Amino acid sequence: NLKVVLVSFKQCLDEKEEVLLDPYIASWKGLVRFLNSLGTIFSFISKDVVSKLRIMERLRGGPQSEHYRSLQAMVAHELSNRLVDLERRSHHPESGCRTVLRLHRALHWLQLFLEGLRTSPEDARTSALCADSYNASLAAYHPWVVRRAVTVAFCTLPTREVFLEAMNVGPPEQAVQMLGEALPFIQRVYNVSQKLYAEHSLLDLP
Numbered sequence: 546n547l548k549v550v551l552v553s554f555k556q557c558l559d560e561k562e563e564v565l566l567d568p569y570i571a572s573w574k575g576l577v578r579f580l581n582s583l584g585t586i587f588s589f590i591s592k593d594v595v596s597k598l599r600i601m602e603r604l605r606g607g608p609q610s611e612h613y614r615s616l617q618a619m620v621a622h623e624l625s626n627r628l629v630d631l632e633r634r635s636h637h638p639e640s641g642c643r644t645v646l647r648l649h650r651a652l653h654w655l656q657l658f659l660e661g662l663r664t665s666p667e668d669a670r671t672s673a674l675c676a677d678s679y680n681a682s683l684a685a686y687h688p689w690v691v692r693r694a695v696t697v698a699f700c701t702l703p704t705r706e707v708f709l710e711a712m713n714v715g716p717p718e719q720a721v722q723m724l725g726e727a728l729p730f731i732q733r734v735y736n737v738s739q740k741l742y743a744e745h746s747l748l749d750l751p
């Protein structure tokens with residue numbers, strides 16, 4: 546179920562507005578399952594996400610586990626212990642900070658795409674909704690060859706009508722309602738993460 550995956554972002558926050566890593570990885574694994582379902586054309590995207598989730602699971606499961614309970618703890622820990630490459634990637638190519646940043650940026654894209662689906666004409670193409678949202682967000686961080694591969698993948702997507710109907714939550718009007726319910730949770734996780742990275746000047750980690 547896609548609704549279950551999207552609303553599971555609700556579990557990432559707590560009363561202290563910590564962004565909890567376990568639930569964050571869980572939600573992303575849900576998104577990976579979606580990506581795998583879409584087929585081999587999207588496999589390069591799934592593989593990159595999985596690669597990053599594995600980095601995070603190794604950090605969260607290892608000797609330093611406690612420091613990775615939340616994004617807030619991870620930032621304080623990696624900064625205190627000099628585990629983040631601020632300018633170019635040298636001895637710390639795969640810090641939790643730089644790794645989560647890539648997933649974070651993709652969450653903004655996901656937000657934009659879900660809003661596009663929600664507000665789109667009945668006769669829209671999902672390729673265009675993806676392209677518009679991508680060119681408006683993630684595209685800025687990807688080199689031309691990656692932007693081309695992404696664009697190619699996008700063009701294989703079906704009409705909006707088909708894409709919504711495939712979510713199996715009723716008529717598009719109801720799938721639109723469902724997206725409206727998940728979005729606030731994703732937006733809030735994004736906003737809290739964005740402020741955390743911004744306040745530590747980490748928005749442009751290499």
Ligand SMILES: CCCCCCCCCCCCC/C=C/[C@@H](O)[C@H](COP(=O)(O)O)NC(=O)CCCCCCCCCCCCCCC
Nearest residue numbers: 547576579580589590593594647648651655679683691695
């Ligand atoms: C139908 C939706 C199709 C999914 C399209 C997602 C478009 C975004 C594609 C970006 C993938 C980029 C491929 C690899 C880029 C990497 O170089 C770069 C990593 O940097 P690094 O090299 O610095 O370590 N990676 C990134 O930018 C991370 C990209 C992760 C994108 C996650 C996409 C989320 C997929 C979930 C979609 C579910 C939609 C649900 C609608 C019901």
